[PDB]
From a paper:
The [name] is activated under a number of stressful conditions via proteolytic degradation of its neutralizing antitoxin MazE by the ClpPA or Lon proteases, (18,30,35) and was proposed to be under control of quorum sensing. In this paper, we present a method to obtain large quantities of active [name] and provide the structure of this protein as determined by nuclear magnetic resonance (NMR) and X-ray crystallography. The [name] dimer is formed by pairing strand S6 from two monomers to form a dimer-wide 10-strand anti-parallel β-sheet.
Three different crystal forms of [name] are available, which lead to the structures of 14 crystallographically independent [name] monomers forming 7 independent dimers. In particular, among the two loops that show higher RMSD values in the X-ray ensemble, loop S3-S4 (Gly48-Lys54) is involved in lattice contacts in all structures. It is unlikely, however, that crystal lattice interactions have a major influence on the conformation of this rather extended loop given that all conformations observed seem to belong to a single family, with only two individual conformations (form I chain D and form II chain A) deviating somewhat from the canonical conformation. Variation of the main chain B-factors closely follows the per residue pair-wise RMSD values. There is however one notable exception: in chain B of crystal form I, elevated B-factors are also observed for residues Ala10-Val23. This is the only indication in our set of crystallographic data that hints toward flexibility of this loop, which in the NMR data behaves as the most dynamic part of the molecule if the termini are excluded. The importance of dynamics in loop Leu12-Ser18 can in the X-ray ensemble only be inferred from one out of 14 monomers (form I chain B), where this loop shows elevated B-factors. Not surprisingly, in this monomer, the loop is not involved in lattice contacts.
Residue numbers in the entry:
A (entry chain B): 0 to 49, 53 to 62, 65 to 113
B (entry chain A): 0 to 114
Write the structure that this text describes.
Amino acid sequence: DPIRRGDVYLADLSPVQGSEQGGVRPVVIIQNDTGNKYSPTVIVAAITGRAKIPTHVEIEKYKLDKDSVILLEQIRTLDKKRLKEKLTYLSDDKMKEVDNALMISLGLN
Amino acid sequence: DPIRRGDVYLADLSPVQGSEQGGVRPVVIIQNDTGNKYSPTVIVAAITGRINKAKIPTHVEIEKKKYKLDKDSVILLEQIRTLDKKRLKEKLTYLSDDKMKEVDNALMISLGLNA
């Protein structure tokens, strides 16, 4: 498996345009778990290889090829078919950080 | 002129896959205005023609009369994405403060946030 918020998957994000984050990489699920259970789509934030940016969350400890960063300014809705290997899932504390970054990114406060 | 949260732009979402919303269509800007000013990208939510009355927590309806829209429409806060600004075409309108509050609420729900 069931897809859950906080899970990290591999996903082919290509193709992309301009300054969009592309290439088959890791992403973290940020959609609520009702949508994750039933809907054909999920919402994710891009993760990339590694400053102090309010919309960025660092992740060391997570089965990752390198020290990475979650980009909360880089988010999108993907068909579940795009999801490949499940890698890990983030701690409750790290998800609190993601939640904070996401609020700032989307001007939610 | 500047791109502002709550603005509605016509935008090119193609190409996409499966149930991802594609096509050239209205989107609403949901990124904060610091990003909208300085960043090469914006984050938006897709808007589609209202195909049926339905009470969906992640959906927010828009009045065709109230705004400059071809049809009665609905904002899909489960269909969002980060777009290079070059994908934005014409600025169509912008949403009221009250309508934007509904959007923020639908967005909190969609993204499993609560406050």
